[PDB]
Write an enzyme that holds these catalytic residues in place. Structure first.
Site, PDB file in Angstrom:
ATOM      1  N   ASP A  99       0.940  -1.429  -0.305  1.00 33.38           N
ATOM      2  CA  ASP A  99       0.249   0.186   0.161  1.00 33.38           C
ATOM      3  C   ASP A  99       0.906   1.133  -0.189  1.00 33.38           C
ATOM      4  O   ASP A  99       0.679   2.122   0.351  1.00 33.38           O
ATOM      5  CB  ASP A  99      -0.620   0.267   1.253  1.00 33.38           C
ATOM      6  CG  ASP A  99      -2.256   0.568   1.331  1.00 33.38           C
ATOM      7  OD1 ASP A  99      -2.366   1.338   0.244  1.00 33.38           O
ATOM      8  OD2 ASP A  99      -2.768   1.112   2.166  1.00 33.38           O
TER       9      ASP A  99
HETATM   10  C1  ZIO Z   1      -1.289   2.232  -7.412  1.00 37.93           C
HETATM   11  O1  ZIO Z   1      -2.995   2.025  -7.243  1.00 37.93           O
HETATM   12  C2  ZIO Z   1      -3.702   2.495  -6.422  1.00 37.93           C
HETATM   13  C3  ZIO Z   1      -4.100   3.988  -7.070  1.00 37.93           C
HETATM   14  C4  ZIO Z   1      -4.477   4.602  -6.483  1.00 37.93           C
HETATM   15  O2  ZIO Z   1      -4.081   5.335  -4.828  1.00 37.93           O
HETATM   16  C5  ZIO Z   1      -4.011   6.746  -4.656  1.00 37.93           C
HETATM   17  C6  ZIO Z   1      -4.456   5.902  -3.146  1.00 37.93           C
HETATM   18  C7  ZIO Z   1      -3.612   4.691  -1.707  1.00 37.93           C
HETATM   19  C8  ZIO Z   1      -5.771   5.446  -2.885  1.00 37.93           C
HETATM   20  O3  ZIO Z   1      -6.230   4.352  -1.087  1.00 37.93           O
HETATM   21  C9  ZIO Z   1      -5.723   3.275  -1.542  1.00 37.93           C
HETATM   22  O4  ZIO Z   1      -7.215   2.863  -1.513  1.00 37.93           O
HETATM   23  C10 ZIO Z   1      -7.610   1.297  -1.626  1.00 37.93           C
HETATM   24  C11 ZIO Z   1      -8.728   0.924  -2.474  1.00 37.93           C
HETATM   25  C12 ZIO Z   1      -7.102   0.845  -0.353  1.00 37.93           C
HETATM   26  C13 ZIO Z   1      -5.813   0.997   0.314  1.00 37.93           C
HETATM   27  N1  ZIO Z   1      -5.487   0.584   1.450  1.00 37.93           N
HETATM   28  C14 ZIO Z   1      -6.036   1.019   2.615  1.00 37.93           C
HETATM   29  C15 ZIO Z   1      -5.568  -0.232   1.568  1.00 37.93           C
HETATM   30  C16 ZIO Z   1      -5.397   2.847  -0.186  1.00 37.93           C
HETATM   31  O5  ZIO Z   1      -4.368   3.042  -0.209  1.00 37.93           O
HETATM   32  C17 ZIO Z   1      -6.685   6.152  -2.689  1.00 37.93           C
HETATM   33  C18 ZIO Z   1      -8.389   5.163  -3.346  1.00 37.93           C
HETATM   34  C19 ZIO Z   1      -7.527   7.156  -1.600  1.00 37.93           C
HETATM   35  C20 ZIO Z   1      -8.571   7.187  -1.119  1.00 37.93           C
HETATM   36  C21 ZIO Z   1      -9.909   6.436  -1.234  1.00 37.93           C
HETATM   37  O6  ZIO Z   1      -9.642   7.739   0.262  1.00 37.93           O
HETATM   38  C22 ZIO Z   1      -8.529   8.767  -2.254  1.00 37.93           C
HETATM   39  O7  ZIO Z   1      -9.302   8.998  -3.281  1.00 37.93           O
HETATM   40  C23 ZIO Z   1      -7.447   9.581  -1.507  1.00 37.93           C
HETATM   41  C24 ZIO Z   1      -8.400  11.131  -1.855  1.00 37.93           C
HETATM   42  C25 ZIO Z   1      -6.734   9.660  -2.968  1.00 37.93           C
HETATM   43  O8  ZIO Z   1      -7.174   9.834  -4.290  1.00 37.93           O
HETATM   44  C26 ZIO Z   1      -5.424  10.736  -2.734  1.00 37.93           C
HETATM   45  C27 ZIO Z   1      -4.794  10.474  -1.375  1.00 37.93           C
HETATM   46  C28 ZIO Z   1      -4.249  10.819  -4.026  1.00 37.93           C
HETATM   47  C29 ZIO Z   1      -3.265  11.840  -4.110  1.00 37.93           C
HETATM   48  O9  ZIO Z   1      -3.855   9.602  -3.794  1.00 37.93           O
HETATM   49  C30 ZIO Z   1      -3.734   8.870  -4.591  1.00 37.93           C
HETATM   50  O10 ZIO Z   1      -3.981   9.030  -6.069  1.00 37.93           O
HETATM   51  C31 ZIO Z   1      -3.143   7.482  -4.278  1.00 37.93           C
HETATM   52  C32 ZIO Z   1      -1.945   6.270  -5.152  1.00 37.93           C
HETATM   53  O11 ZIO Z   1      -5.532   4.242  -5.563  1.00 37.93           O
HETATM   54  C33 ZIO Z   1      -5.719   2.619  -5.522  1.00 37.93           C
HETATM   55  C34 ZIO Z   1      -6.967   1.903  -5.575  1.00 37.93           C
HETATM   56  C35 ZIO Z   1      -5.062   1.815  -6.042  1.00 37.93           C
HETATM   57  O12 ZIO Z   1      -4.579   0.589  -5.677  1.00 37.93           O
END
Ligand code: ZIO
Ligand code: GDP
Ligand code: NH4
Ligand code: NH4
Ligand code: NH4
Ligand code: NH4
Length: 300
Positions: A199
Protein backbone atom coordinates in the site's frame (compact mmCIF):
# COMPACT_ATOMS: atom_id res chain seq x y z
CA UNK A 1 -18.68 21.61 28.84
CA UNK A 2 -17.69 21.19 25.15
CA UNK A 3 -18.73 18.23 23.01
CA UNK A 4 -15.65 16.62 21.43
CA UNK A 5 -15.37 13.89 18.87
CA UNK A 6 -13.01 11.76 20.99
CA UNK A 7 -14.41 9.72 23.90
CA UNK A 8 -11.51 10.35 26.21
CA UNK A 9 -12.85 8.14 29.05
CA UNK A 10 -13.15 5.11 26.82
CA UNK A 11 -9.84 5.77 25.13
CA UNK A 12 -8.06 6.12 28.46
CA UNK A 13 -9.56 2.88 29.71
CA UNK A 14 -8.65 0.98 26.55
CA UNK A 15 -5.08 2.22 26.55
CA UNK A 16 -4.58 1.58 30.27
CA UNK A 17 -5.63 -2.09 29.83
CA UNK A 18 -2.51 -2.45 27.72
CA UNK A 19 0.03 -0.53 29.77
CA UNK A 20 -0.31 2.95 28.24
CA UNK A 21 -1.35 5.95 30.32
CA UNK A 22 -2.95 8.67 28.19
CA UNK A 23 -2.37 12.22 29.37
CA UNK A 24 -2.53 15.37 27.35
CA UNK A 25 -3.50 16.40 23.79
CA UNK A 26 -5.07 14.01 21.37
CA UNK A 27 -6.46 13.84 17.81
CA UNK A 28 -8.94 11.36 16.17
CA UNK A 29 -9.67 10.00 12.70
CA UNK A 30 -12.87 7.98 12.25
CA UNK A 31 -12.71 8.05 8.47
CA UNK A 32 -11.12 4.61 8.35
CA UNK A 33 -13.56 1.86 7.53
CA UNK A 34 -11.50 -0.71 9.48
CA UNK A 35 -9.70 1.23 12.26
CA UNK A 36 -10.15 4.29 14.37
CA UNK A 37 -6.84 6.14 14.47
CA UNK A 38 -6.00 8.29 17.46
CA UNK A 39 -2.79 10.17 18.00
CA UNK A 40 -2.54 10.68 21.71
CA UNK A 41 -0.06 11.96 24.20
CA UNK A 42 1.09 9.53 26.86
CA UNK A 43 2.62 10.10 30.32
CA UNK A 44 6.06 9.49 28.75
CA UNK A 45 5.68 12.96 27.13
CA UNK A 46 5.54 11.13 23.79
CA UNK A 47 2.78 10.96 21.16
CA UNK A 48 1.57 7.45 20.47
CA UNK A 49 -0.59 6.23 17.67
CA UNK A 50 -3.60 4.16 18.70
CA UNK A 51 -4.88 1.90 15.87
CA UNK A 52 -8.20 0.65 17.07
CA UNK A 53 -9.70 -2.31 15.17
CA UNK A 54 -13.42 -1.74 14.49
CA UNK A 55 -14.54 -5.36 14.08
CA UNK A 56 -13.51 -8.96 14.75
CA UNK A 57 -12.51 -9.46 11.09
CA UNK A 58 -10.06 -6.55 11.39
CA UNK A 59 -8.75 -7.68 14.74
CA UNK A 60 -7.82 -10.99 13.14
CA UNK A 61 -5.21 -9.23 11.02
CA UNK A 62 -3.27 -7.72 13.96
CA UNK A 63 -1.20 -10.75 14.93
CA UNK A 64 0.08 -11.57 11.44
CA UNK A 65 0.98 -7.90 10.81
CA UNK A 66 2.77 -7.78 14.16
CA UNK A 67 4.99 -10.65 12.96
CA UNK A 68 5.74 -8.75 9.76
CA UNK A 69 6.80 -5.63 11.58
CA UNK A 70 8.89 -7.61 14.08
CA UNK A 71 10.86 -9.09 11.20
CA UNK A 72 11.20 -5.89 9.30
CA UNK A 73 12.45 -3.72 12.21
CA UNK A 74 16.22 -4.53 11.84
CA UNK A 75 16.12 -5.27 8.12
CA UNK A 76 15.23 -1.78 6.87
CA UNK A 77 17.40 1.39 6.86
CA UNK A 78 14.36 3.39 7.85
CA UNK A 79 11.78 3.27 10.57
CA UNK A 80 8.60 1.27 10.80
CA UNK A 81 5.92 1.35 13.51
CA UNK A 82 7.10 -0.33 16.75
CA UNK A 83 3.97 -2.10 17.85
CA UNK A 84 4.71 -2.21 21.54
CA UNK A 85 0.99 -2.91 21.99
CA UNK A 86 -0.48 -5.42 19.57
CA UNK A 87 -3.71 -7.21 20.38
CA UNK A 88 -7.20 -7.63 19.04
CA UNK A 89 -8.65 -4.56 20.78
CA UNK A 90 -5.72 -2.21 20.29
CA UNK A 91 -2.52 -1.64 18.36
CA UNK A 92 -0.28 1.13 19.67
CA UNK A 93 3.11 2.44 18.71
CA UNK A 94 5.17 5.51 19.49
CA UNK A 95 4.44 8.06 16.80
CA UNK A 96 7.08 8.35 14.13
CA UNK A 97 7.05 12.11 14.28
CA UNK A 98 8.42 12.82 10.78
CA UNK A 99 5.86 14.08 8.34
CA UNK A 100 4.19 11.97 5.70
CA UNK A 101 5.33 12.89 2.17
CA UNK A 102 1.77 14.00 1.40
CA UNK A 103 -0.21 16.11 3.81
CA UNK A 104 -3.99 15.92 3.59
CA UNK A 105 -6.65 17.03 6.01
CA UNK A 106 -8.98 14.27 7.08
CA UNK A 107 -12.12 14.13 4.95
CA UNK A 108 -10.61 16.15 2.11
CA UNK A 109 -10.07 14.81 -1.39
CA UNK A 110 -7.27 17.32 -2.11
CA UNK A 111 -3.90 17.25 -0.28
CA UNK A 112 -2.42 20.36 1.21
CA UNK A 113 1.06 19.40 0.01
CA UNK A 114 2.95 16.62 -1.75
CA UNK A 115 6.73 16.38 -1.73
CA UNK A 116 7.80 18.10 -4.95
CA UNK A 117 8.73 16.36 -8.16
CA UNK A 118 12.06 18.20 -8.33
CA UNK A 119 13.01 17.01 -4.83
CA UNK A 120 16.09 15.06 -5.72
CA UNK A 121 16.59 13.95 -2.09
CA UNK A 122 13.13 12.47 -1.90
CA UNK A 123 13.35 10.80 -5.28
CA UNK A 124 16.74 9.27 -4.62
CA UNK A 125 16.06 8.19 -1.05
CA UNK A 126 12.68 6.68 -1.98
CA UNK A 127 14.35 4.68 -4.72
CA UNK A 128 17.08 3.32 -2.37
CA UNK A 129 14.55 2.70 0.42
CA UNK A 130 12.48 0.64 -1.99
CA UNK A 131 15.47 -1.32 -3.19
CA UNK A 132 16.26 -2.09 0.47
CA UNK A 133 12.75 -3.26 1.15
CA UNK A 134 12.68 -5.45 -1.89
CA UNK A 135 15.98 -6.95 -0.82
CA UNK A 136 14.54 -8.39 2.40
CA UNK A 137 15.09 -12.17 2.05
CA UNK A 138 12.13 -14.37 1.15
CA UNK A 139 13.34 -16.73 3.85
CA UNK A 140 12.75 -13.98 6.43
CA UNK A 141 9.24 -13.46 5.11
CA UNK A 142 8.49 -17.22 5.29
CA UNK A 143 9.89 -17.44 8.81
CA UNK A 144 7.61 -14.50 9.74
CA UNK A 145 4.53 -16.29 8.36
CA UNK A 146 3.91 -13.78 5.59
CA UNK A 147 1.61 -14.33 2.69
CA UNK A 148 3.78 -15.61 -0.10
CA UNK A 149 2.98 -15.43 -3.82
CA UNK A 150 5.23 -16.99 -6.42
CA UNK A 151 5.25 -15.26 -9.80
CA UNK A 152 2.51 -17.64 -10.92
CA UNK A 153 0.44 -16.98 -7.78
CA UNK A 154 0.95 -13.26 -8.23
CA UNK A 155 -0.45 -13.40 -11.70
CA UNK A 156 -3.33 -15.59 -10.62
CA UNK A 157 -4.29 -13.14 -7.89
CA UNK A 158 -4.59 -10.39 -10.45
CA UNK A 159 -6.66 -12.69 -12.67
CA UNK A 160 -8.92 -13.59 -9.73
CA UNK A 161 -9.42 -9.89 -8.78
CA UNK A 162 -10.34 -9.07 -12.35
CA UNK A 163 -12.74 -11.95 -12.46
CA UNK A 164 -14.43 -10.92 -9.22
CA UNK A 165 -14.93 -7.43 -10.60
CA UNK A 166 -16.38 -8.92 -13.79
CA UNK A 167 -18.92 -10.94 -11.78
CA UNK A 168 -20.07 -8.02 -9.62
CA UNK A 169 -19.82 -5.01 -11.93
CA UNK A 170 -20.38 -4.03 -15.56
CA UNK A 171 -17.02 -2.94 -16.93
CA UNK A 172 -16.11 -0.82 -19.96
CA UNK A 173 -15.30 -3.20 -22.79
CA UNK A 174 -11.86 -1.63 -23.56
CA UNK A 175 -10.87 -1.76 -19.96
CA UNK A 176 -11.66 -5.42 -19.75
CA UNK A 177 -9.65 -6.11 -22.90
CA UNK A 178 -6.77 -4.09 -21.51
CA UNK A 179 -6.62 -6.20 -18.36
CA UNK A 180 -6.96 -9.46 -20.27
CA UNK A 181 -4.22 -8.49 -22.75
CA UNK A 182 -1.97 -7.67 -19.83
CA UNK A 183 -2.69 -10.95 -18.11
CA UNK A 184 -1.78 -12.75 -21.36
CA UNK A 185 1.31 -10.72 -22.08
CA UNK A 186 4.09 -12.96 -20.75
CA UNK A 187 6.88 -10.44 -21.30
CA UNK A 188 5.26 -7.98 -18.88
CA UNK A 189 5.31 -10.28 -15.81
CA UNK A 190 8.28 -10.74 -13.54
CA UNK A 191 9.91 -14.10 -13.03
CA UNK A 192 10.44 -13.44 -9.32
CA UNK A 193 8.65 -12.04 -6.27
CA UNK A 194 9.84 -9.77 -3.44
CA UNK A 195 8.78 -8.52 -0.06
CA UNK A 196 6.41 -5.64 -0.92
CA UNK A 197 4.82 -3.03 1.23
CA UNK A 198 1.54 -3.39 -0.69
CA UNK A 199 0.00 0.00 0.00
CA UNK A 200 2.92 2.25 -0.84
CA UNK A 201 2.38 5.82 -1.92
CA UNK A 202 3.48 9.24 -0.60
CA UNK A 203 0.81 9.10 2.11
CA UNK A 204 2.48 6.12 3.76
CA UNK A 205 6.05 7.35 3.38
CA UNK A 206 7.68 9.44 6.13
CA UNK A 207 10.31 12.06 5.41
CA UNK A 208 12.64 14.11 7.54
CA UNK A 209 13.08 17.93 7.31
CA UNK A 210 15.30 17.55 4.24
CA UNK A 211 12.67 15.38 2.44
CA UNK A 212 14.77 12.23 2.86
CA UNK A 213 12.76 9.04 3.36
CA UNK A 214 12.96 8.19 7.05
CA UNK A 215 10.14 5.68 7.50
CA UNK A 216 7.10 3.91 6.05
CA UNK A 217 3.76 3.29 7.81
CA UNK A 218 0.61 1.09 7.34
CA UNK A 219 2.02 -2.29 6.54
CA UNK A 220 -1.33 -4.13 6.51
CA UNK A 221 -0.98 -5.20 2.85
CA UNK A 222 2.61 -6.46 3.09
CA UNK A 223 3.39 -9.80 1.48
CA UNK A 224 5.79 -11.43 -0.98
CA UNK A 225 4.46 -10.57 -4.43
CA UNK A 226 5.08 -8.59 -7.64
CA UNK A 227 7.69 -5.82 -7.07
CA UNK A 228 5.75 -3.48 -9.34
CA UNK A 229 2.95 -3.25 -6.77
CA UNK A 230 5.19 -0.79 -4.90
CA UNK A 231 5.95 1.40 -7.93
CA UNK A 232 2.45 2.07 -9.43
CA UNK A 233 1.62 4.89 -7.07
CA UNK A 234 4.97 6.53 -7.74
CA UNK A 235 3.99 6.64 -11.39
CA UNK A 236 0.61 8.11 -10.55
CA UNK A 237 2.03 10.92 -8.39
CA UNK A 238 5.28 11.76 -10.17
CA UNK A 239 4.46 10.69 -13.73
CA UNK A 240 6.59 8.89 -16.28
CA UNK A 241 9.52 11.18 -15.80
CA UNK A 242 9.57 10.38 -12.11
CA UNK A 243 9.20 6.69 -12.77
CA UNK A 244 12.12 6.74 -15.08
CA UNK A 245 14.27 8.38 -12.35
CA UNK A 246 13.02 5.80 -9.82
CA UNK A 247 13.87 2.83 -11.95
CA UNK A 248 17.42 4.03 -12.80
CA UNK A 249 18.31 4.58 -9.14
CA UNK A 250 16.46 1.50 -7.94
CA UNK A 251 18.54 -0.64 -10.26
CA UNK A 252 21.75 1.14 -9.38
CA UNK A 253 20.95 0.46 -5.69
CA UNK A 254 20.71 -3.27 -6.39
CA UNK A 255 16.97 -3.59 -7.11
CA UNK A 256 16.24 -6.36 -9.54
CA UNK A 257 14.53 -5.18 -12.71
CA UNK A 258 13.38 -6.71 -15.95
CA UNK A 259 13.09 -5.21 -19.42
CA UNK A 260 9.31 -4.49 -19.46
CA UNK A 261 9.16 -3.33 -15.83
CA UNK A 262 8.07 0.27 -16.69
CA UNK A 263 5.35 -1.12 -18.94
CA UNK A 264 4.21 -3.47 -16.21
CA UNK A 265 4.00 -0.70 -13.66
CA UNK A 266 1.73 1.30 -15.89
CA UNK A 267 -0.50 -1.82 -16.32
CA UNK A 268 -0.49 -2.26 -12.52
CA UNK A 269 -1.57 1.38 -12.12
CA UNK A 270 -4.50 0.72 -14.51
CA UNK A 271 -5.39 -2.31 -12.47
CA UNK A 272 -5.87 0.08 -9.55
CA UNK A 273 -9.47 0.46 -10.79
CA UNK A 274 -10.01 -3.19 -9.90
CA UNK A 275 -8.50 -2.80 -6.46
CA UNK A 276 -10.64 0.24 -5.82
CA UNK A 277 -13.80 -1.52 -6.98
CA UNK A 278 -13.15 -4.52 -4.77
CA UNK A 279 -12.44 -2.25 -1.82
CA UNK A 280 -15.75 -0.53 -2.53
CA UNK A 281 -17.61 -3.81 -2.77
CA UNK A 282 -16.09 -5.32 0.36
CA UNK A 283 -16.79 -2.15 2.36
CA UNK A 284 -20.44 -1.90 1.36
CA UNK A 285 -20.05 1.89 1.37
CA UNK A 286 -22.38 3.47 -1.20
CA UNK A 287 -20.25 6.51 -2.03
CA UNK A 288 -17.22 4.31 -2.74
CA UNK A 289 -19.43 1.98 -4.80
CA UNK A 290 -20.84 4.83 -6.83
CA UNK A 291 -17.32 6.06 -7.59
CA UNK A 292 -16.10 2.60 -8.45
CA UNK A 293 -18.99 1.81 -10.82
CA UNK A 294 -18.64 5.08 -12.53
CA UNK A 295 -14.93 4.49 -13.02
CA UNK A 296 -15.31 0.94 -14.24
CA UNK A 297 -17.93 1.81 -16.80
CA UNK A 298 -15.93 4.79 -18.03
CA UNK A 299 -13.53 4.56 -20.90
CA UNK A 300 -9.92 4.94 -19.70
C1 ZIO B 1 -1.30 1.94 -7.30
O1 ZIO B 1 -2.67 1.95 -7.48
C2 ZIO B 1 -3.47 2.62 -6.52
C3 ZIO B 1 -3.80 3.94 -7.11
C4 ZIO B 1 -4.61 4.77 -6.18
O2 ZIO B 1 -3.84 5.08 -5.05
C5 ZIO B 1 -4.09 6.21 -4.23
C6 ZIO B 1 -4.47 5.69 -2.84
C7 ZIO B 1 -3.32 5.03 -2.02
C8 ZIO B 1 -5.91 5.12 -2.55
O3 ZIO B 1 -5.99 4.56 -1.28
C9 ZIO B 1 -5.97 3.13 -1.32
O4 ZIO B 1 -7.22 2.69 -1.89
C10 ZIO B 1 -7.31 1.24 -1.77
C11 ZIO B 1 -8.62 0.81 -2.32
C12 ZIO B 1 -7.12 0.80 -0.38
C13 ZIO B 1 -5.84 1.24 0.15
N1 ZIO B 1 -5.53 0.83 1.60
C14 ZIO B 1 -6.53 1.22 2.49
C15 ZIO B 1 -5.48 -0.65 1.66
C16 ZIO B 1 -5.75 2.71 0.06
O5 ZIO B 1 -4.46 3.18 0.48
C17 ZIO B 1 -7.06 6.16 -2.70
C18 ZIO B 1 -8.19 5.38 -3.35
C19 ZIO B 1 -7.47 6.79 -1.39
C20 ZIO B 1 -8.75 7.60 -1.43
C21 ZIO B 1 -9.95 6.86 -1.32
O6 ZIO B 1 -9.44 7.59 -0.20
C22 ZIO B 1 -8.83 8.86 -2.28
O7 ZIO B 1 -9.66 8.97 -3.18
C23 ZIO B 1 -7.78 9.94 -2.05
C24 ZIO B 1 -8.40 11.32 -2.08
C25 ZIO B 1 -6.67 9.85 -3.05
O8 ZIO B 1 -7.11 9.99 -4.39
C26 ZIO B 1 -5.49 10.84 -2.89
C27 ZIO B 1 -4.95 10.74 -1.47
C28 ZIO B 1 -4.41 10.61 -3.97
C29 ZIO B 1 -3.41 11.69 -3.92
O9 ZIO B 1 -3.72 9.37 -3.80
C30 ZIO B 1 -3.24 8.56 -4.84
O10 ZIO B 1 -3.80 8.61 -5.93
C31 ZIO B 1 -2.88 7.15 -4.37
C32 ZIO B 1 -1.87 6.68 -5.39
O11 ZIO B 1 -5.76 4.08 -5.76
C33 ZIO B 1 -5.58 2.62 -5.38
C34 ZIO B 1 -6.88 1.94 -5.42
C35 ZIO B 1 -4.63 1.84 -6.23
O12 ZIO B 1 -4.36 0.56 -5.56
N1 GDP C 1 3.66 11.09 10.71
C1 GDP C 1 2.99 9.98 11.08
N2 GDP C 1 1.70 9.83 10.75
C2 GDP C 1 1.04 8.71 11.10
C3 GDP C 1 1.74 7.66 11.85
N3 GDP C 1 0.85 6.67 12.07
C4 GDP C 1 -0.31 7.07 11.52
N4 GDP C 1 -0.18 8.25 10.92
C5 GDP C 1 -1.26 9.01 10.20
O1 GDP C 1 -2.54 8.36 10.34
C6 GDP C 1 -3.09 8.12 9.04
C7 GDP C 1 -3.91 6.85 8.91
O2 GDP C 1 -3.24 5.92 9.71
P1 GDP C 1 -3.18 4.45 9.12
O3 GDP C 1 -2.33 3.57 10.00
O4 GDP C 1 -2.90 4.65 7.67
O5 GDP C 1 -4.70 3.97 9.23
P2 GDP C 1 -5.28 3.00 8.10
O6 GDP C 1 -5.10 3.67 6.75
O7 GDP C 1 -6.75 2.82 8.41
O8 GDP C 1 -4.57 1.66 8.09
C8 GDP C 1 -1.87 7.98 8.14
O9 GDP C 1 -2.17 8.07 6.73
C9 GDP C 1 -0.99 9.07 8.71
O10 GDP C 1 -1.39 10.35 8.23
C10 GDP C 1 3.13 7.91 12.20
O11 GDP C 1 3.78 7.11 12.92
N5 GDP C 1 3.66 9.04 11.79
N1 NH4 D 1 4.11 -15.18 -14.51
N1 NH4 E 1 -3.58 -7.27 6.92
N1 NH4 F 1 -5.77 -6.02 5.24
N1 NH4 G 1 -0.99 -8.63 3.31
Amino acid sequence: TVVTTADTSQLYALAARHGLKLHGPLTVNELGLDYRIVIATVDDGRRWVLRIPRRAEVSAKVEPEARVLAMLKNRLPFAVPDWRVANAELVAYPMLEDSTAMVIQPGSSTPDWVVPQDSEVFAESFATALAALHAVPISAAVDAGMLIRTPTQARQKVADDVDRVRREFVVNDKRLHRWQRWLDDDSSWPDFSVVVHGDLYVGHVLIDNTERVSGMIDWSEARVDDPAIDMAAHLMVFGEEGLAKLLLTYEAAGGRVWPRLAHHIAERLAFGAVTYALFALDSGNEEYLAAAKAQLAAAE
